[PDB]
C-alpha cells in the first residue's frame, strides 16, 4: 500500500503520495475566520476557511498561521489543516496509508509527541514517521555528503552530513526566515508611503517579495547605484489598481539574511553560520563539506543568493578550498521530493512506527526509538 508524504512547513503545506515526482497538493498553511457581521440570511456562512479557500476570501477574514517558528502553536487549527489536506485536497482515507511527517531539527519534543498522538488517535493512520527536513533535502539532491542550508518560512537551519552520518553537535538553527523578511518589508515600505497593516495586506506584501526582491552581490555599491540612477525601480500593481514602485527595498529586504541586525537580531548572517557549522566539524570532512553546500527551501529562491553565498564563504574559507553552492532549480520542493524517495525505499518499510508499537509504548515512542 502506498504511503503519504506531508511536509508541513510554516507557510505552505505540500502533500502527495510516496513515489511521485512532485507534491500533489500545495496550498497555504492558513486558517481564516470571518471578521464582519453577515447580513444575507441563507448564505450558508462557514465557521472557518482553510487552505487557499481562505486565501481568495481573505478580504473579509482574519488569517492565522497555526505554526509560528516551526512549532505548532495552535493544535485545533493544525487539526483542521490536516483534515483538509487528507479529505479535500488528496481525497483519501487516512486509515489506509502510512504517513511521513516532517519536522525541523532542534525544536521541542512535545511537538513530535503531539504530532504522533494526533495522527494515531484522530486519524487512525496504520503507521507514521517524523523525518528531518535537511536529511530529506539531501536525499533529493542525490548526495550522501554535504552541509544543507534549509530556509523556509519559519526557521533556517544547517545540518552537516558526511557519508550518511549526521553531526548533531554542529547543527545550527536560526529563527529568521521568509516571514521575518515579509515583516521587514512591510516595515520598510512605509518609508515610501505605502501602509500594509492587515493580514491580507501581509499576503500582498509576501507576493511583492516573491516577485520583485533579489540579493545584491555587493550591498554597498548596489546602494550607491540605486541612489545615483533610477534603473533599479520596478512597479507592482495591487489588486485594486494603484500601482506602487519600489527602489532599493528590492535588495534591502533579503539582505537581512546576511545582516540580521537589520531586524534587531544579534545572530550572524547565513553565510557566517554556515561557515561556523563547517568549522565545528572534524578537520577531515570539512574539505568535502565546503564543496557540497546544498540550498533548500523557499527563502533560498531569491535571484543572486547563490552567488552572494559563494562570494561570502569564499572570503571566509581558506584560499585553497573549492566552494560550491548547489542550488537546484526546483529547490523549493526538495524536502518533499526527498521524503517521497525515502518513503519509497524497500529498506525503509521496517522504520515505520506501527499502531501496535504506539499502543504499547504511548506517544513517547516517537523519539525513544525512531
Amino acid at each position: 500500500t502506498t504511503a503519504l508524504v506531508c511536509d508541513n512547513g510554516s507557510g505552505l503545506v505540500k502533500a502527495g503520495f510516496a513515489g511521485d515526482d512532485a507534491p500533489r497538493a500545495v496550498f497555504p498553511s492558513i486558517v481564516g475566520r470571518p471578521r464582519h457581521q453577515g447580513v444575507m440570511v441563507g448564505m450558508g456562512q462557514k465557521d472557518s476557511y482553510v487552505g487557499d479557500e481562505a486565501q481568495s476570501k481573505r478580504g473579509i477574514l482574519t488569517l492565522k498561521y497555526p505554526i509560528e517558528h516551526g512549532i505548532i502553536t495552535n493544535w485545533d487549527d493544525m487539526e483542521k489543516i490536516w483534515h483538509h489536506t487528507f479529505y479535500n485536497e488528496l481525497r483519501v482515507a487516512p486509515e489506509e496509508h502510512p504517513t511521513l511527517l516532517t519536522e525541523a531539527p532542534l525544536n521541542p519534543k512535545a511537538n513530535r509527541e503531539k504530532m504522533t498522538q494526533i495522527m494515531f488517535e484522530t486519524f487512525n493512520v496504520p503507521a507514521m514517521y517524523v523525518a528531518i527536513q535537511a536529511v530529506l533535502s539531501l536525499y533529493a539532491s542525490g548526495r550522501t555528503t554535504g552541509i544543507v542550508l534549509d530556509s523556509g518560512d519559519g526557521v533556517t537551519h544547517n545540518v552537516p552530513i558526511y557519508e550518511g552520518y549526521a553531526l548533531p553537535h554542529a547543527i545550527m538553527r536560526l529563527d529568521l526566515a521568509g516571514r521575518d523578511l515579509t515583516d521587514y518589508l512591510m516595515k520598510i515600505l512605509t518609508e515610501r508611503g505605502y501602509s500594509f497593516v492587515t493580514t491580507a495586506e501581509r499576503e500582498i506584501v509576501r507576493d511583492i517579495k516573491e516577485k520583485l526582491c533579489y540579493v545584491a552581490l555587493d550591498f554597498e555599491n548596489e546602494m550607491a547605484t540605486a541612489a545615483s540612477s533610477s534603473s533599479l525601480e520596478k512597479s507592482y500593481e495591487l489588486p485594486d489598481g494603484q500601482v506602487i514602485t519600489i527602489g532599493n527595498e528590492r535588495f534591502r529586504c533579503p539582505e537581512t539574511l546576511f545582516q540580521p541586525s537589520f531586524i534587531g537580531m544579534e545572530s550572524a548572517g547565513i553565510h557566517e553560520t554556515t561557515y561556523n557549522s563547517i568549522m565545528k566539524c572534524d578537520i577531515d570532512i570539512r574539505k568535502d563539506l565546503y564543496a557540497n553546500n546544498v540550498l533548500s527551501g523557499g527563502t533560498t529562491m531569491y535571484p543572486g543568493i547563490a552567488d552572494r553565498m559563494q562570494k561570502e564563504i569564499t572570503a571566509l574559507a581558506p584560499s585553497t578550498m573549492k566552494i560550491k553552492i548547489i542550488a537546484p532549480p526546483e529547490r523549493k520542493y526538495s524536502v518533499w521530493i526527498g521524503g517521497s524517495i525515502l518513503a519509497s525505499l524497500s529498506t525503509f518499510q521496517q522504520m515505520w512506527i506501527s499502531k501496535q508499537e504506539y499502543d504499547e509504548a504511548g506517544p513517547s515512542i516517537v523519539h525513544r526509538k525512531c
Binding site: 505540500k14 513515489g19 511521485d20 515526482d21 512532485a22 507534491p23 500533489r24 497538493a25 500545495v26 496550498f27 481525497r91 536525499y139 539532491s141 542525490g142 548526495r143 550522501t144 548547489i326 537546484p328 532549480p329 526546483e330 523549493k332 520542493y333 524517495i341 519509497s344 525505499l345 524497500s346 529498506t347 518499510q349
Partner: protein, 519 residues
C-alpha cells in the same frame, strides 16, 4: 514423438516424413490421447474436444529457444486446426510474420534468430466449433536491447537490415551512413553475422509491408522512427562550464532527429535539458546532470520502439481479422526457454524468472490433475502441494525485499554502486536463504557475484552494470513534444489534484498479466 506424463516431447527429425500428411494419419478424429499413437495432433484433437465439451479456453505452451522445431511444429498444428474446424489463415499468419522476425529477433550468442518476446496466438472457434478469425497477442519484450548489447551479439535485425545499403532512398531519407560503428545503440557487440544476409531480409520485410495494409507513410514513417532511434545513439552533451548542468556540443544529430520525427531542434534540446513537472497547480523546471539526461534519451528511444512494436501488432491483428461474432479459442503460447550461458546477466535473470513462473504454473496444473486422479479411484493419499510450495521459496526475487526489489531500492538510493548493491544483497539474503548462496569463482572463468538454486540447477549471475539496465526515468516534456509531432505516425502512437519507472517493474507486471491470462 513421445509422451512424458503430461508433456509432449517431440524431436526434430531433420527428415521429411509422411507422419503428418496426408489425413491418412490425421484420422485421429474423436480419439483420446491415451489410445492413439503419441502424436501432437491427438493433443490438438483433445484440445478441440475439451474446448467444445466445457466451453473453456485452452492453452498450448511449447518450448521455443530451440532454433527449429518450433517453426515446423507451430505450422503443422495450426494446419491441423485449420483442417478440423473448417489464402487460408495459416497463409495469412505466415505472410506478415517477417514483421515479428525483423522487430523481435536478433543474433544471440547461442543462436542466430531468437524470439525476444512472447507469441500468444489466439485461434478462435465458433460457438459450435467452427474456426473463426485468429488474433495474435504479444507481450513483454527485452527492450533493454534497444540501447545496450553485450559482446558477440546485437540488437533487433531491422537496424542491420536497413543498414544493408540495399535501398539508398531510405539511407538518404534518414540522413544516415552505412557504417554501423558510428551509431552506438547497435555497435556495442558485433555489427554483422555472416550466417545470414541482410539484403534478402530487407526485401522480405518490404514484401511484408506491402502485403500488409501499410501505405508509403506506414513504411517510410517506421523507417524514420528506426533512423531517429539510431541517431539518438550519438547525441553528445557536456556539463555547463563551471556548473552542474548538461550543455549540448554539436547539434547535427539533433537536426536529423528534429527533421525526422517532425519536431523542433531547440525544443527537443531544451526539453531534454530542462524537464518540467506539474507541482500542484503550477509548473517549475528541473535541473539535470548529464547522466540523467542520457537516461532520459535511452528511455525515450525504448518507449518509441516499444509503442511502435505494439502498434504494428495491433495493425497485423486487424489485417488478419474479418469474421462473424465468435466465442471460443485455443491459446498457442510460444515463449523463450531457460538460459544457462557461461556469462549470465540481468536479462537472463528476467527470462529465468519468467520461466520459473511458467514452470510453477505447470506444476500447479499437474498437481491438481494428479490430485483429481487420486480422488477418482478412492485412493486415499494426500501430500504437500507439489505445484506451488517447492517453488514459492525461489521467488524471493518478487517479494518486495528480494533481489529485484533491492535492485530498484538502490536505483532510487543516491550514489548507489554495484558494490553497495552487493553489500545490501548479502545483508538481506546471505545465510538467511538456502537458495541464495555464494558463487564458486575459481580462476579460469569470469567472476559471478551470487548464486541461486532454480529448478534448472544452480545459476550464477554477475551484477556489473545493472543500474544502467533497470533505470527508466521518463521525460514527460518530450512526451508532450511527441504527442504533437507533425509525423502522423508519431501522433497515432502517442495519442492517448515518472522518474521512478524501472524495467523490473514493467517486466514483473507484464509477467503477472500473462499469468492471469493463463490461469
Amino acid at each position: 514423438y513421445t509422451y512424458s506424463g503430461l508433456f509432449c516431447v517431440t524431436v526434430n527429425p531433420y527428415k521429411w516424413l509422411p507422419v503428418y500428411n496426408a489425413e491418412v494419419v490425421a484420422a485421429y478424429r474423436g480419439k483420446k490421447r491415451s489410445e492413439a499413437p503419441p502424436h501432437i495432433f491427438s493433443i490438438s484433437d483433445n484440445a478441440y474436444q475439451y474446448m467444445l465439451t466445457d466451453r473453456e479456453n485452452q492453452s498450448i505452451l511449447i518450448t521455443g529457444e530451440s532454433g527449429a522445431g518450433k517453426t515446423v511444429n507451430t505450422k503443422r498444428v495450426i494446419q491441423y486446426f485449420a483442417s478440423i474446424a473448417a489464402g487460408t489463415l495459416e497463409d495469412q499468419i505466415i505472410q506478415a510474420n517477417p514483421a515479428l522476425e525483423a522487430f523481435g529477433n536478433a543474433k544471440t550468442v547461442r543462436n542466430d534468430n531468437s524470439s525476444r518476446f512472447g507469441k500468444f496466438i489466439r485461434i478462435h472457434f465458433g460457438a459450435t466449433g467452427k474456426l473463426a478469425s485468429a488474433d495474435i497477442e504479444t507481450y513483454l519484450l527485452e527492450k533493454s536491447r534497444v540501447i545496450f548489447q553485450l559482446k558477440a551479439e546485437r540488437n533487433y535485425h531491422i537496424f542491420y537490415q536497413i543498414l544493408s545499403n540495399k535501398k539508398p532512398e531510405l539511407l538518404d531519407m534518414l540522413l544516415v551512413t552505412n557504417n554501423p560503428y558510428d551509431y552506438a545503440f547497435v555497435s556495442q557487440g558485433e555489427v554483422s553475422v555472416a550466417s545470414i544476409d541482410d539484403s534478402e531480409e530487407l526485401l522480405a520485410t518490404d514484401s511484408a509491408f506491402d502485403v500488409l495494409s501499410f501505405t508509403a507513410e506506414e513504411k517510410a514513417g517506421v523507417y524514420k522512427l528506426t533512423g531517429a532511434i539510431m541517431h539518438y545513439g550519438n547525441m553528445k552533451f557536456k556539463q555547463k562550464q563551471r556548473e552542474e548542468q548538461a550543455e549540448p556540443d554539436g547539434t547535427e544529430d539533433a537536426d536529423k532527429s528534429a527533421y525526422l520525427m517532425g519536431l523542433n531542434s531547440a525544443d527537443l534540446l531544451k526539453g531534454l535539458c530542462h524537464p518540467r513537472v506539474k507541482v500542484g497547480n503550477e509548473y517549475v523546471t528541473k535541473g539535470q546532470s548529464v547522466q540523467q539526461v542520457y537516461y532520459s534519451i535511452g528511455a525515450l528511444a525504448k518507449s518509441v520502439y516499444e509503442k511502435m512494436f505494439n502498434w504494428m501488432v495491433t495493425r497485423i491483428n486487424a489485417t488478419l481479422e474479418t469474421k462473424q461474432p465468435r466465442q471460443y479459442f485455443i491459446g498457442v503460447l510460444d515463449i523463450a526457454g531457460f538460459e544457462i550461458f557461461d556469462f549470465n546477466s540481468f536479462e537472463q535473470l528476467c527470462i529465468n524468472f519468467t520461466n520459473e513462473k511458467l514452470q510453477q504454473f505447470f506444476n500447479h496444473h499437474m498437481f491438481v490433475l494428479e490430485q483429481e486422479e487420486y480422488k477418482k479411484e478412492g485412493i486415499e493419499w494426500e501430500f504437500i502441494d507439489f505445484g506451488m510450495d517447492l517453488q514459492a521459496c525461489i521467488d524471493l526475487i518478487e517479494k518486495p525485499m528480494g533481489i529485484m526489489s533491492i535492485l530498484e531500492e538502490e536505483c532510487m538510493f543516491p550514489k548507489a554502486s554495484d558494490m553497495t548493491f552487493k553489500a545490501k544483497l548479502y545483508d538481506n539474503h546471505l545465510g538467511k536463504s538456502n537458495n541464495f548462496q555464494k558463487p564458486r569463482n575459481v580462476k579460469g572463468k569470469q567472476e559471478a557475484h551470487f548464486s541461486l538454486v532454480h529448478y534448472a540447477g544452480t545459476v550464477d549471475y554477475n551484477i556489473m552494470g545493472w543500474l544502467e539496465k533497470n533505470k527508466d526515468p521518463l521525460n514527460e516534456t518530450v512526451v508532450g513534444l511527441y504527442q504533437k509531432s507533425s509525423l502522423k505516425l508519431m501522433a497515432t502512437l502517442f495519442s492517448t489534484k515518472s522518474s521512478f519507472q524501472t524495467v523490473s517493474a514493467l517486466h514483473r507486471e507484464n509477467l503477472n498479466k500473462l499469468m492471469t491470462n493463463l490461469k
